[PDB]
Amino acid sequence: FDSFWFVQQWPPAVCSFQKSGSCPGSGLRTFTIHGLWPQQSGTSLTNCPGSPFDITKISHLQSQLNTLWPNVLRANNQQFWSHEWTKHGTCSESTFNQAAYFKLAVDMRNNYDIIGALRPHAAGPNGRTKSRQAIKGFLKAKFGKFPGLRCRTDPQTKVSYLVQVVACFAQDGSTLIDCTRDTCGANFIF
Ligand SMILES: O=c1ccn([C@@H]2O[C@H](CO)[C@@H](OP(=O)(O)O)[C@H]2O)c(=O)[nH]1
């Protein structure tokens, strides 16, 4: 792998697209971790042969993971962590064992506070329209590199909503680099 995509999701927006059934994320008001995805030549490496998910290797992080990496779609956090490890984590296991991988995600979340970076500049979430250039600009100023913005369009109103924010890192897992792919248009609700 040549880099990582550290993806955080905005729970309320993610769950807004679940028009039927329950969705735990509807009640969260901070960005949570979706995943840490190894990249290779501009694409996500997935399903690499590797070690099976082992909860005992991250037992010391259960408090932090339950708070920062909850399953926002269903009430089963462990299943989500297992799924992310098998689908993405195994692809960077050559350098980051399971324990180091989850610790890395936790540290990245604690050092990349999105709302904290936006709030002071009147760019915090309020259900109104925001500019893609503005949001990317504020994050670039605070963290030093451009983030990736991911949006989804509501089937009913055809309005675009910001759902995920990506922080791009080099293969060392600590050096931030510019992201290059957004799925958001010029404007979106946040
Ligand atoms: O909080 C979250 C956010 C996303 N997912 C995602 O929704 C799917 C549920 O089966 C999972 O795999 P998918 O890409 O492979 O199909 C996971 O990526 C969750 O489970 N929980």
**Domains of the chain, first to last:** 1-190 (3.90.730.10)
Query: Which residue carries 């690499």 as its tokens?
Result: 48
Pick from 131, 187, 162: nearest CA to 14: 162
Pocket-testing residue among 10, 26, 30, 34, ligand 1, by greatest number of atoms within 8 A of Cβ = 34
Pairing label, strands 187-189, 129-131: antiparallel
Nearest to 43, CA basis, from 75, 2, 93, 97? 2
- The CB density around residue 145, as the number of other CB atoms within 10 Å, is 14
Binding residues: 9, 34, 71-72, 74, 80, 83-84, 87-88
Ligand 1 contact, 73 CB (< 6 A): yes
Q: How was this structure determined?
A: X-ray
Residue 95 Cα distances to 92, 98, 99, 101, angstroms: 6, 10, 11, 9
How far is 155 from 133, CA to CA, in rounded Å?
A: 25
Q: Which residue, among 76, 65, 63, 69, has the nearest Cα to 28 in the 3D structure?
A: 69
* Site to substitute for ligand 1 among 8, 65, 83, most atoms within 8 A of C-beta: 83
Confirm if 53 and 90 have CB atoms less than 8 A apart: no
Task: Identify whether 34 is a catalytic site residue.
Answer: yes
Q: Are 138 and 121 spatial neighbours (Cβ–Cβ below 8 Å)?
A: yes
The question of whether 60 is a catalytic residue gets the answer no
175 three-class SS = coil
- For this experimental structure, what is the resolution in angstroms? 1.8
| Backbone phi, psi, residue 187, to 5° | -135, 160
DSSP symbol at 20: S
Q: CA-CA distance, 123 to 120, in Å (whole number)?
A: 7
Taking the CB of residue 53, how many other CB atoms lie within 10 A of it?
18
Breaks (C-N over 2.5 A) in the chain follow: none
Which tokens sit at 184?
Answer: 């958001």
**Distance from the Cα of residue 133 to its chain's centroid:** 19
Instruction: Report the SS3 class of residue 87.
Output: helix
How much distance in Å is there from the Cα of 85 to the middle of ligand 1? 12
Chain mean position to CA 151: 12
H/E stretch holding 96 reads none
Residues pairing with 6 in the sheet? 36, 167
Antiparallel, parallel or unpaired: β 3-9 and 160-170: antiparallel
Q: Which of 28, 153, 131, 159 is nearest to 123 (CA)?
A: 131
What is the distance between the terminal CA atoms of the chain, rounded to a whole angstrom? Answer: 32
Residue 149, classified by CB atoms within 10 Å of its CB into exposed (0-12), middle (13-18) or buried (19+), is buried
